[PDB]
Amino acid sequence: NREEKILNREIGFAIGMPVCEFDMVKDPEVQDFRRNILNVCKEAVDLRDLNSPHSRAMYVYPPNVESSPELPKHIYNKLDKGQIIVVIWVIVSPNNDKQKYTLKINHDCVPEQVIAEAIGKYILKVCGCDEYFLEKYPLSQYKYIRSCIMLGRMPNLMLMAKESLYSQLPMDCFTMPSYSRKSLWVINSALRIKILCATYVNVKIYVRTGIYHGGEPLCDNVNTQRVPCSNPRWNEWLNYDIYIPDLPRAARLCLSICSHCPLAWGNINLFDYTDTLVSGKMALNLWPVPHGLEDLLNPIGVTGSNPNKETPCLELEFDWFSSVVKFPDMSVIEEHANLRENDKEQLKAISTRDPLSEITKQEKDFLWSHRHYCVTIPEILPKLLLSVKWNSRDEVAQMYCLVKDWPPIKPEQAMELLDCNYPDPMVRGFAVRCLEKYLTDDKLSQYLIQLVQVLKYEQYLDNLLVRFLLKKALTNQRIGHFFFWHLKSEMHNKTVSQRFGLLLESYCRACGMYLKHLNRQVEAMEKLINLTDILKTQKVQMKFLVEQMRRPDFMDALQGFLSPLNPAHQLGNLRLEECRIMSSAKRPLWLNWENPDIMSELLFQNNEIIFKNGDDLRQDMLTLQIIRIMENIWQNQGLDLRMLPYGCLSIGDCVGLIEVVRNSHTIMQIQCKGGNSHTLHQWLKDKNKGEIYDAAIDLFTRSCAGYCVATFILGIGDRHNSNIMVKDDGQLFHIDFGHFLDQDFLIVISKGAQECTKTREFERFQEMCYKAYLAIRQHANLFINLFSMMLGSGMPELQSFDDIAYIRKTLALDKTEQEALEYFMKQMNDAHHGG
Ligand SMILES: Cc1nc(NC(=O)N2CCC[C@H]2C(N)=O)sc1-c1ccnc(C(C)(C)C(F)(F)F)c1
To answer: Are the CB atoms for 91 and 99 separated by under 8 Å?
Structure first.
């Protein structure tokens, strides 16, 4: 076929695993997933082609927008009576002559008004990248115009006739592949499950078991007798304290061959995606030794079986009811389940506490009793759920009248419900139902790294989170682009390869034309991915890389595609001269691309990117996104702390891409230390003289107050002279993040004086440093939720809550607002010896 086979090899390249290899998968829980049940995502395509070509265009080019419509008061003061001056680079002649035009327009206007003033047949293109002003959003909402107003930059916006884009987007529609087309509450018996034997036991060995719903034990942890290692003929019908109807929906039984150190752990759902209590013999390969865990079991893991079949396999014999028993529908459960001194104040004391606050059982019973009032205060839902034992049918039934009827909570609050705890299929249903309705495309863009890692927390392959993420990826090629590259990064993990290959190929069938560009991205990456592996010492390196991009096969894949950091950055022919290799630890690729846009000179004549291959960049993105929200809740309250949360994307295993800031000058190891202690201020002064000397100092403090407290609140690592850089408008920021939660700058704030503490400018630096954590400690629930969502990300730092206790220490969440003022002051006056 010319429509089925046209796509099934492009897909095999854009995932790296042939669709044939997943056609031959014998596991019954893949074919049911891939069938038309997910292919209702074609409705997403129906959404993206509803009103052609405007709907198609808004799909293909996603606006980059700020989540804050109303411009803040200080940014409003950054404007001349709330007015921005923008240059319009009209092109009319067929030649290269450009007719520019300058306009003074109210910052609350719209691209339609810009079109009307400059002169609907035209669209505004950001001059130097394929950023397009298309939909009816205010000018100041776009990140380009908002950043222009913030930095006082001169905004550049060329005019292009719409036909130059409407006719530049060939259509590519959706063709389906060949695969297009008792009750557990009436039994009376304890949980009685047999261990047969282990096929590949490794050298009194016993199976330690237990029922878990979360990290919470659901009964006594039944064990086996101590058989000899040679012949593990267990054959034991272990009797669990858990009565079978009491088994909850997500109650994966946890095996542990234990020599009480677990030789091998493994989770197995006590249900399945069709709500069937697993029966019959089951030979499952067990997962390797727990990663940094000395627990009695390892419920911190994935359900199902191990794809690697060389691991010790244990044989099990589940319940034999001589029939099939199904978990009741939610209607039957719901039918089954069918004051101001502290009953209103203690509740608010709980709600305002972080989810990491260990709720006492004496207070868990208080939370449990006031179900009828905790429903009125929404932000307590993450804590009411933990106030319920999953040992019981009646307890969980009582909750299912609450979390199903719970009024929706704010999206950053509903993102905690998708962690390792809260593993109920309906808790995550509520979390995703809130995340769909309230989360916006740029907040989703920030939080997508979190949402990808919580696919692994839902127990079946056809989640509702999968549906949400796929539908969003089929409407913007930023959710699509970054979702695709997140999954491609997490393909190399065998644990989630089965999920993520199917998810990827579900996306590669309905993304559209972008797949080719996506392939051209992947191809362009896999040469660089190859190139780095070829590379794994500079002049030979420089000439080798020049030779390796001058070849026609290499130069073909490395030209005319889009940046994996920004598809709006239309990469053209490589600037062969300005591409080099650093003398760094992993030797990343400094790569420069000329802009095929006619007028490259406005934003940037050339596009610069760092290509790291060897270091994980999920923690780097985690730091940069925490920085982004911290800035957005500092620069929305009027505390004009200035910083740069820039682009970062890990494209595979420990391989990724970083947008170079060319404005930010050399590292301070040379820009300040010259690879004397007065170099930084002198260099900043000689590069900024006159009446402009205010901001170049004024924005330095606001660029050092917000990063001394960010490196504090999140416990970020050491700040060497090779880790910090500085712009020329006084801005500085940190670039080499990574692992965390584990004076030259002083004289600049005092404007060159060798004595700084006595100065008033140092005092204002302190008084904005304090206001920095005044609101960050007011917004701690968001940060705790975000940190908690990355526990199963595989990051070596976020393994358990014992590491998120570090941010608890740094923010001191237990103390009162007045008492927390001196908490930072102690370490702050310890760092610089007085303040
Ligand atoms: C965001 C960003 N902007 C840069 N800017 C220049 O390097 N510039 C700016 C122009 C000249 C050049 C220079 N020598 O000054 S670097 C950088 C960055 C971000 C993250 N990690 C790194 C490295 C180099 C430490 C790593 F780890 F990748 F090797 C760099």
So the answer is: yes
Whether ligand 1 lies within 6 angstroms of the CB of 645 is answered as no
Element (H, E) at 609: strand 606-613
Q: Atom of ligand 1 at shortest distance to CA of 590? A: 7
Handedness of CA 469, 614, 800, 284 (dihedral sign): positive
Alpha carbon distances (Å) from 473 to 33, 60, 506, 512, 687: 18, 11, 11, 11, 45
* Interval between CA 548 and ligand 1 midpoint (Å): 23
Q: Which atom of ligand 1 is nearest to the CA of 620?
A: 20
Nearest to 413 by CA among 383, 386, 387, 441: 383
| 79 CB near ligand 1 (under 6 Å) | no
Query: What is the C-alpha separation between 249 and 359, in angstroms, rounded?
Result: 24
φ, ψ for residue 648, nearest 5 deg: -155, 135
Distance CA 23, CA 348 (A): 54
Q: Are 477 and 564 in contact (CB under 8 A)?
A: no
Instruction: Please work out whether the CB of residue 688 comes within 6 Å of at least one atom of ligand 1.
Output: no
Structure tokens at 18: 């042939």
Experimental technique behind these coordinates: cryo-EM
CA of 114 to the centre of ligand 1 (A): 36
Ligand 1 lined by 608 (C-beta under 6 Å): no
Give which of 5, 129, 64, 104 is closest to 482, Cα–Cα.
64
Structure tokens at 295: 């627990």
**613 CA to middle of ligand 1, Å?**
15
- The pick from 578, 612, 660 for probing ligand 1's pocket by mutation, whose C-beta has the most ligand atoms within 8 angstroms, reads 660
Provide the terminal-to-terminal Cα distance of the chain, rounded to the nearest Å.
75
What's the token pair of residue 274?
């069709």
Whether residue 168 contacts residue 596, with contact meaning beta carbons closer than 8 Å, is answered with no
Which two three-digit tokens encode residue 535?
């590379």
338 contacts: CB under 8 Å, gap ≥ 6: 401
Contact, 59 vs 475, CB < 8 A?
yes
* Cα 688 to ligand 1 centroid, rounded to whole Å: 23
Q: Which residues contact 151 (CB under 8 A, 6 or more apart)?
A: 729
Atom of ligand 1 nearest to the CA of 660: 3
Asked if 518 and 473 touch (Cβ cutoff 8 Å), the reply is no
Contact (Cβ atoms closer than 8 angstroms) between residue 787 and residue 801: no
Cβ proximity of 75 and 149 under 8 Å:
yes
For the chain, how are helix, strand and coil distributed in percent, rounded to 5?
A: 40, 15, 45
Whole-Å CA distances, 767 to 161, 705, 756: 51, 9, 15
Name the residue with the closest Cα to ligand 1, atom 16.
660
Sheet holding 156-161, edge to edge: 99-106, 83-90, 156-161, 122-126, 132-133
Q: How far is the CA of 690 from the centre of ligand 1 (A)?
A: 29
- DSSP state string for 786-813: HHHTTSTT--SS-SSHHHHHHHHHHHTT
Q: Is 656 in the pocket of ligand 1 (CB under 6 A)?
A: no
CA distances from residue 617 to 449, 532, 613 in whole angstroms, order as listed? 11, 16, 10
Closest C-alpha to ligand 1, atom 11: 662
Outline where 135-247 has alpha helix (H): 143-151, 163-166
Phi, psi dihedrals of residue 713, rounded to the nearest 5°: -60, -40
Q: Give, for ligand 1, the residue of 590, 649, 735, 737 to mutate: max count of ligand atoms closer than 8 Å to Cβ.
A: 735
Q: 342 φ, ψ to 5°?
A: -135, -20
Residue with tokens 């490196």: 711
Q: Contact 252/267 with Cβ under 8 angstroms?
A: yes
